[PDB]
Every structure is written in C-alpha cells, then in structure tokens.
Design a protein around this ligand. Structure first.
Ligand SMILES: *[C@@H]1O[C@H](CO)[C@@H](O[C@@H]2O[C@H](CO)[C@@H](O[C@@H]3O[C@H](CO)[C@@H](O)[C@H](O[C@H]4O[C@H](CO)[C@@H](O)[C@H](O)[C@@H]4O)[C@@H]3O)[C@H](O)[C@H]2NC(C)=O)[C@H](O)[C@H]1NC(C)=O
Ligand SMILES: *[C@@H]1O[C@H](CO)[C@@H](O[C@@H]2O[C@H](CO)[C@@H](O[C@@H]3O[C@H](CO)[C@@H](O)[C@H](O[C@H]4O[C@H](CO)[C@@H](O)[C@H](O)[C@@H]4O)[C@@H]3O)[C@H](O)[C@H]2NC(C)=O)[C@H](O)[C@H]1NC(C)=O
Ligand SMILES: *[C@@H]1O[C@H](CO)[C@@H](O[C@@H]2O[C@H](CO)[C@@H](O)[C@H](O)[C@H]2NC(C)=O)[C@H](O)[C@H]1NC(C)=O
Ligand SMILES: *[C@@H]1O[C@H](CO)[C@@H](O[C@@H]2O[C@H](CO)[C@@H](O)[C@H](O)[C@H]2NC(C)=O)[C@H](O)[C@H]1NC(C)=O
Ligand SMILES: *[C@@H]1O[C@H](CO)[C@@H](O)[C@H](O)[C@H]1NC(C)=O
Ligand SMILES: *[C@@H]1O[C@H](CO)[C@@H](O)[C@H](O)[C@H]1NC(C)=O
Ligand SMILES: [Ca+2]
Ligand SMILES: [Ca+2]
Lengths: 71, 51, 103, 71, 103
C-alpha cells in the first residue's frame, strides 16, 4: 500500500510499512482558514483515527486515495 | 459595514485546570434607532464554562 | 523589481480614511470570526474575564487590485497599520485600561 | 393582531401569535444618543412590560400602532 | 565622508515593505536561531513560562550592497527598525499582553 504523506516536503508518495493499510487525511480550519484554507495532514495508519469535533477525515484503503485537493 | 458572523475556532484551545469549556457560540444581532431605518449590527460570542 | 513598481502604484492616491468601495452607497461586507486559545482568569471581585484570542477580519478592497501576469511572482502584499483602511471593530464591553488589547 | 417588530431586519409587520394582543415599543438613550438618537425595540407582548427608570414605553392594542418614528 | 555618500546611495529608492530578492519568484532564506539566558518564571496558575532570550535572524539583502574599494573604511552600516525590511518572525504562542516582547 502506497499512501501520500505530509511529514515529507515536498509532498511525497511514500510506501507505507506493514500493518497499516489505510491511507487517511485529516482537515480542519486553523486561524488562517480565510486565506490559506483548511489544514491538511496525510498519512497511513493501522485503522483510521478518531475524528475530533472540529476535524474531518476521509479514509480510504486503496493506493494514492488521499492526495492534496489541487491533485 | 455589513458585518457577517462566521463561527469560532477551538483547535488551539489549551485547558487551564480550573474551568471546563462547554462552548463558545455566536449570535449576530441588530439594533434600530430613532434617527433612521438603517440597522446597527453586532456579533456576540458567549463563553460558557463550568468550574 | 516588480514589487517596487506595484507598491508604488497601489499607494499613488490611496487614502486610509476612505472606506474601500466602488459605490459609496453600497455596503462593505466584513467577515468577523474568532479563535480562542485559553482562559486566563475569571475574577469575581472586579467581574472581569481575561481571555487570549485572535480576531479574524476578512474584507475586500477595490483599490488594491493588480494583474498577476504584469507582476510575475508578486501574489501578495502586506501593509502596516496606518497605510490602508481597517474597520473599527472593537470590544464594547472592554475593561482593559487601554481599551484596545490588540496587537 | 399585527405588531411591528425589530427582531426582523428590515423592520417587519409580523403577525403576532395568540395570547399577546398588545403591540409595544421601548425607547431609551444609549451612549450614541447624540447622533443616532434613542434606541427602539418593537414587539407584541402578553401585557406591556415594566418600564425601568431610563426606559420609555408607549403601549397600544391596535394593528400597526407601534411604527418606527420616521413612519 | 564616504559614510554620508554610502548612506545616501543605499536609501535612494529603498522600500521597507519589499522583500529584498532579485527575483520575486525565488524565496528569501532566513536563518533563525536562539540564545537562552535564564528561566525567569514557570507559573502553573496561568500556565505561562517566562524566559529571557535573544533571537538571531540572518538573511541577505540584494539592494544593500556596495564596493569596499570605492568606500574605504566603511565595512558596515546600521539601520533602525523602519528603514529597511525585517521578517515578521514572532511567537505564535505568546501570552505577553503586547504580543511582541522584543526590543
Ligand atoms: C484571494 O483570496 C480570496 C480568499 O482567500 C480568494 O477567494 C476565495 O477562494 C476560495 C478558494 O477558491 C473560495 O473557497 C471556495 O468556495 C466555493 C464556494 O463556497 C467552494 O465550493 C469551494 O470548494 C472547495 O473547497 C472545498 C473544501 O471542502 C472542497 O471540498 C472542494 O472540492 C473545493 O476544492 C471553495 O471552498 C472562496 O469562496 C473565495 N472567496 C472567499 C471570500 O473566501 C481569491 O480567489 C483570491 N484571489 C486570487 C487571485 O488568488
Ligand atoms: C447632523 O447631526 C445632528 C445631531 O445628530 C443633527 O441635528 C440633530 O437632529 C436631531 C434629529 O432631527 C434633533 O433632534 C430633534 O430635536 C427637536 C428639537 O429639540 C425635537 O423636537 C425632535 O423630536 C423628535 O424626536 C422625538 C424624540 O422623542 C420624537 O418624539 C419626535 O416626534 C421627533 O421625531 C428631535 O428630537 C437635534 O435637535 C438636532 N441637533 C442636535 C444638536 O442634536 C443634524 O440634523 C445632522 N445633519 C444632517 C445633515 O443630517
Ligand atoms: C450606486 O448605488 C446606487 C444605489 O443602488 C445606484 O442607484 C440605484 O440604481 C438602481 C439600479 O441598479 C436603481 O434601481 C435605484 O433606484 C437607484 N437608486 C438611487 C438612489 O439612485 C447607483 O446607480 C450606483 N452607481 C453606479 C455607478 O452603479
Ligand atoms: C525568476 O525565476 C523564475 C522561476 O524559476 C524563472 O523562470 C524559470 O526559469 C527556469 C530556467 O532557470 C525555467 O526552467 C522555468 O521553467 C521558468 N519558470 C517560469 C515560471 O518562468 C525566471 O527566469 C527568473 N528570472 C530571471 C530574470 O532569472
Ligand atoms: C491582465 O489581465 C487580463 C485579464 O483580466 C489579461 O487579458 C491580460 O493579459 C493581463 N495583462 C497582461 C500584461 O497580460
Ligand atoms: C569594485 O569591485 C570590482 C570587483 O567586483 C573591482 O574590480 C573594482 O576595482 C571595484 N571598484 C573600484 C573603484 O576599484
Ligand atoms: Ca478567581
Ligand atoms: Ca511557580
């Protein structure tokens, strides 16, 4: 499974380790949600994590299902 | 000046250890006056907390 | 290079006392929001709540517009306090002793 | 009974619910009583409410008896 | 003698709002570091840490350049706050009541 991630800049297409076959992304508004927009965190996790009240998650199980919105 | 209230942000909240934040909802309100029909708006955020 | 030219053009006749609308009769829309960071103090002796917050104002200025194709690379500009118009949004129920606690 | 109200902008001519057949208006000076003038609150109430020391009330029982002073 | 001439030349058309790069598309590199001097207070009532620190910013300005051979002895110049560009580096998690604690 290959999941996009943000811990690497520029945005990478790192290939996920075993035990974690869900690419996920998490998005919320910070202060600068007027000009910059919502934040973006991409990764691969064991099972997709908890959604706080102010956080949104879109969880996939396929390769490159979590790209940056521009893409 | 047509004020528009968009919602508050708690992504950065830092609990302090003496008050629990129930919420911080907002309300846009308007006030009229004798001089003319034009309304004067305002935005009120109500911090609710329990000890 | 292009920055100098742009900054010159934008302040050629700009007035910071003028509400930036094309038609003076129509209103200017201002989106006002908030970002709480923590509760700092809840005094009952003086009946004062001390908070840490970042305001968020968003509006549109008609006079600060330019063509990106004519100024390649200059996608944004930044202006200090007294060089362009800001709205007079402030806390009615302030007990600060300077009445505008903002930076 | 139809009573003017201010909770709706522009000033409306809302039609009052039952049990409340008194259109009222309440007016007082705020800080900006030099340029803007006195405040205006219009509505329909069961019986017209209490007048604080700094508040003035003009209570009617007829349709559209509580308009904005301009009108 | 040469100082007067240099200071005149350097501010002939300088704008302190303009990021000092030759190509506006390329970025400006800023080296940011720190120097701690002591811990001043660690409050648990307000959850505030009070420190004494000196920031260290280092960048490169394209418009403030000169030939040493043409200005003998003038190896450096010094500019106050509002006469040249400085970056807007500041503490996001500040609780100071003036929000910029820097001198
Ligand atoms: C100068 O800055 C302003 C404001 O920053 C900018 O105008 C804004 O642009 C954004 C992004 O294009 C707009 O946001 C869009 O709004 C529409 C309508 O509400 C939405 O349908 C769009 O949806 C996108 O985002 C969603 C988020 O979940 C995605 O799911 C979706 O797939 C889309 O990608 C998007 O949110 C915004 O409405 C405007 N206006 C304002 C006031 O914010 C302007 O373009 C900038 N100018 C230049 C020259 O860059
Ligand atoms: C520039 O601003 C000034 C001040 O804001 C303004 O002059 C003021 O206008 C108001 C409103 O016209 C005046 O108030 C009036 O005063 C007279 C005489 O005292 C009253 O009879 C009027 O009565 C009205 O209000 C009553 C309130 O209960 C109503 O019951 C009654 O039915 C009337 O509607 C009214 O109060 C005020 O006297 C002047 N001057 C000053 C110093 O306030 C001026 O007109 C503005 N200029 C422009 C071009 O707009
Ligand atoms: C500026 O705004 C005024 C107010 O809307 C415009 O005048 C109005 O124009 C509309 C047509 O869109 C008419 O229906 C109104 O009766 C007009 N009212 C008045 C008081 O004139 C005016 O045309 C606008 N100016 C420009 C240049 O567009
Ligand atoms: C300023 O920077 C831009 C961006 O790099 C330069 O345009 C690029 O030039 C390189 C060649 O080094 C090309 O490979 C890119 O395709 C160009 N991109 C764009 C968007 O034009 C530009 O040449 C630079 N200006 C100067 C005067 O050097
Ligand atoms: C300016 O913008 C217009 C579109 O609004 C475009 O046609 C034109 O090419 C731009 N300027 C230049 C120099 O290209
Ligand atoms: C200016 O610097 C150049 C080298 O970059 C040098 O050749 C020249 O001599 C210098 N100016 C003078 C007046 O010598
Ligand atoms: Ca207390
Ligand atoms: Ca302590």
């Amino acid at each position: 499974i290959v999941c996009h991630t943000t811990a690497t800049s520029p945005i990478s297409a790192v290939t996920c380790p075993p035990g974690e076959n869900l690419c996920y992304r998490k998005m919320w508004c910070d202060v600068f949600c007027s000009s910059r927009g919502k934040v973006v965190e991409l990764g691969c996790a064991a099972t997709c994590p908890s959604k706080k009240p102010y956080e949104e998650v879109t969880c996939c199980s396929t390769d490159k299902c979590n790209p940056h919105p521009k893409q | 000046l047509d004020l528009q209230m968009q919602e508050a942000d708690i992504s950065g909240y830092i609990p302090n250890g003496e008050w629990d934040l129930v919420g911080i909802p907002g309300k846009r309100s308007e006030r009229f006056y004798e001089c003319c029909k034009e309304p004067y708006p305002d935005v009120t955020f109500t911090v609710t907390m329990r000890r | 290079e292009f920055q100098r030219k742009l900054y010159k053009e934008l302040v050629k006749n700009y007035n910071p006392l003028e509400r930036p609308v094309a038609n003076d009769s129509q209103p200017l829309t201002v989106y006002f929001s908030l970002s709480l960071l923590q509760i700092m103090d809840v005094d009952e002796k003086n009946q004062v709540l001390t908070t840490n917050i970042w305001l968020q104002m968003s509006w549109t200025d008609h006079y600060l517009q330019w063509n990106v194709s004519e100024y390649p690379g200059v996608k944004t500009v930044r202006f200090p306090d007294g060089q362009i118009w800001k709205p007079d949004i402030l806390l009615y129920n302030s007990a600060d002793e300077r009445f505008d606690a903002t930076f």
